[PDB]
Amino acid sequence: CRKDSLAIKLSNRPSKRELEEKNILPRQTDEERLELRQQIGTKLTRRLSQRPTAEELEQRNILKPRNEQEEQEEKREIKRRLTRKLSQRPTVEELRERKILIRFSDYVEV
């Protein structure tokens, strides 16, 4: 009957906690809400006043300047140049001859 719509509705009612999480039953005073909003506001004004610039954040390696493809390009080019530079690498004797390795017995293990 109607008492069955009511019985089915009563059986379904959530906990007070459930309403609380759904923001139907507040967990604090309007005063406490005001306190909180004020604290938030002042913290915010502080951090905003201290807020760094975009370039300051780029030099910190947080704000990435180069696009994905451009970065991939620089990485590839770095690999390339490093390989080409490492292959063309002289001998310890070649350097000792060129007055570059001033000390004997340095890199002689090679």
Binding site: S5, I8, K9, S11, N12, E18, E20, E21, K22, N23, R27, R33, R37, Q39, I40, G41, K43, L44, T45, R47, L48, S49, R51, P52, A54, L57, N61, I62, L63, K64, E68
Partner: protein
């Protein structure tokens, strides 16, 4: 007194700076035989209805001007030339788009000042933070937005075209599979209400499916307007499960926890700890009971064993974006930040890029 306008894909939230909650919340629809929002929904039978904001980005400017007009005049009952206006925008909003927003605000509505803030950033501000990672899931779009010192990190932003509307649709489909028929728009509204009232996110999905099949403990009852009574079982948690398993609706995309983790990983390693300890959830689609605990579990499962994980999900989060704006526009130090009408007159639409960042 400044105004705050959060332009949702589904709902416009509008109000006055300094207030704890928005004065008016209404669906973002435009009806033509012009009707906007609630009135359009009421007149929905007589006329076809169109969504000006889809997936968080403004696509129809005439309709958007109609929405803003309805907002100022019908909903808030104010004269736009008498109030600074803070508008919200989606993450990764195109330059031309925000430029057009600025142009329309100054030329059409003659505001003395305005500002455009990223929704996720405002969400972060509402909790009193300027650094952390925001999961903003609304009606039309979901974002992961990592933010350092108020700056959104564009390279690490994740966009997912899976949100509340999609969850409602999925719920209609699975309820239909159970044998209750929900094809019409009014029936759709009923299903949306069912979703909002009865759905939740299971902590362990397999165990919850097994529980739902083993007993009636999870079953709930919904009384339709016709007085018909329906029973909903696993649909309660199968519906929002789609957020973690988008494959439920045929998407190949990763779930929200995986996108949170990936977004975190795309950021520099040094700030990463700061990101893990500050997960802020915002938007209506984050309102499901149990979602914070599930996110905690999944992120804990993905992150390093010793990493500190904190999920921030206040009960007020459904409107937290707006709240952030409400706080920001009421700060004294913000007053200089506004784009003034003189400045706009001098620089044009270009000024928003320089002034807002």
């Amino acid at each position: 007194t400044a105004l705050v306008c959060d332009n949702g894909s589904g709902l416009v939230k509008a109000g006055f700076a300094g207030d704890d909650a928005p004065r008016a919340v209404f669906p973002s629809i435009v009806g033509r035989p012009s009707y906007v929002g609630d009135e359009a929904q009421s007149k929905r039978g007589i006329l076809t209805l169109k969504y000006p904001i889809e997936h968080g980005i403004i696509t129809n400017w005439d309709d958007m001007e109609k929405i803003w007009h309805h907002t100022f005049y019908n909903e808030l009952r104010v004269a736009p030339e008498e109030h600074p206006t803070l508008l919200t925008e989606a993450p990764l909003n195109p330059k031309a788009n925000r430029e057009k927003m600025t142009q329309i605000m100054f030329e059409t509505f003659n505001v003395p000042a305005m500002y455009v803030a990223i929704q996720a950033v405002l969400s972060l501000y509402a909790s009193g933070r300027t650094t952390g990672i925001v999961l903003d899931s609304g009606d039309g779009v979901t974002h992961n937005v990592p933010i350092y010192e108020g700056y959104a990190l564009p390279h690490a932003i994740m966009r997912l075209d899976l949100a509340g509307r999609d969850l409602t649709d999925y719920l209609m489909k699975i309820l239909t599979e159970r044998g209750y028929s929900f094809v019409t728009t009014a029936e759709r509204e009923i299903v949306r209400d069912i979703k909002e009232k009865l759905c939740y996110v299971a902590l362990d999905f397999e165990n919850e499916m097994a529980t739902a099949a083993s007993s009636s403990s999870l079953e709930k009852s919904y009384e339709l307007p016709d007085g018909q009574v329906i029973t909903i079982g696993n649909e309660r948690f199968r519906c929002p499960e789609t957020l973690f398993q988008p494959s439920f609706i045929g998407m190949e995309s990763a779930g929200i926890h995986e996108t949170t983790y990936n977004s975190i990983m795309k950021c520099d390693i040094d700030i990463r700890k700061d990101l893990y300890a500050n997960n802020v959830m915002s938007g209506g689609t984050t309102m499901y009971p149990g979602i914070a605990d599930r996110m905690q579990k999944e992120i804990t499962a993905l992150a390093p064993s010793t990493m500190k994980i904190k999920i921030i999900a206040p009960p007020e989060r459904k409107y937290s974006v707006w709240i952030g704006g409400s706080i920001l526009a009421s700060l004294s130090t913000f007053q200089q930040m506004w784009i003034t009408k003189q400045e706009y007159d001098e620089a044009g639409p270009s000024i928003v890029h320089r002034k807002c960042f």
